[PDB]
Design a protein around this ligand. Sequence first.
Ligand SMILES: O[C@@H]1[C@@H](O)[C@H](O[C@@H]2[C@@H](O)[C@H](O[C@@H]3CO[C@@H](O)[C@H](O)[C@H]3O)OC[C@H]2O)OC[C@H]1O
Length: 307
Amino acid sequence: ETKPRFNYNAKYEPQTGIYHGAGQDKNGFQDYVNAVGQDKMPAIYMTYVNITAPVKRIESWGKDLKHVLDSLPKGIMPQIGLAFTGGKDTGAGLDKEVANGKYNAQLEAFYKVLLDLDRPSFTRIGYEFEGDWNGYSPESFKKVFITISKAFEEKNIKSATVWCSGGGSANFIGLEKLMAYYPGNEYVDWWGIDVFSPEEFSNIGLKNFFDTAHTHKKPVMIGASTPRYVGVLDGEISWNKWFKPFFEMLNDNPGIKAFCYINWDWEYWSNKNGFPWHDWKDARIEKNPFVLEAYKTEMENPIFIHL
Ligand SMILES: O[C@@H]1[C@@H](O)[C@H](O[C@@H]2[C@@H](O)[C@H](O[C@@H]3CO[C@@H](O)[C@H](O)[C@H]3O)OC[C@H]2O)OC[C@H]1O
């Protein structure tokens, strides 16, 4: 019942399967891998960097990322959420400033990290680009995306660009509004969408998003996902509310070629990081035997590409 995948021949797009990804901190990733099994190690590791931070924070982010990756098995692909926000979900978009060159020094530090990493990766440039909490504006967002996409190309950087929608969290805006943020097929390697609340699975906006990704001839990555407002601690109830439709969505949409599951205690990270996820519930699959076993079982589906 897993539909054979479509192939668009995009950069780092697998021919037949779905990349297994997880995040989004070092120890949460290792806990998740120990729960699902070392033979089901994700091909994709989630990470994040804000290009408006000081150059030194870009450099330390890069150094820590290489440290983490080189202590994991060879071949893991970093999946980088690149932000340019001036506050923590306060609508403080800095895309105009980036578009005007005020952060070129940070961009150069970013390019240098990817060049030193010298390995296949993904960059979600300005991920969840239409979310009000990021506060980006369409014309400057596109100019930033095109600039980074062209720099990747010109430097032969080993990273696929990902144009990643906030989906239901941004109220599934119409296609005309989405396209205001679209830089054009020539600059975009993959589409992405992030899937959180369980009602999103049945929203017609989600199907419409897959429909137009397919006719832009782009594979879709689930750029981030977690059982928001569900968690894992209710066993079969948790599974049926979120995980069951989640894996149905992967099965039913042939253009989905990667997924990224966030294995987090959101209440902990909300207090630690200062972001508003306090009521998102506990998403650590290892904290519930039913969910862990059911999830491990889904990862045994041959469609999924581990390692
Ligand atoms: O600084 C980053 C955060 O930006 C990052 O956020 C991700 C993102 O995928 C998303 O963001 C929320 C979407 O729903 C809105 O209602 C919330 O306001 C957003 O914060 O979900 C949370 C994270 O997965 O997290 C990592 C941080 O380092």
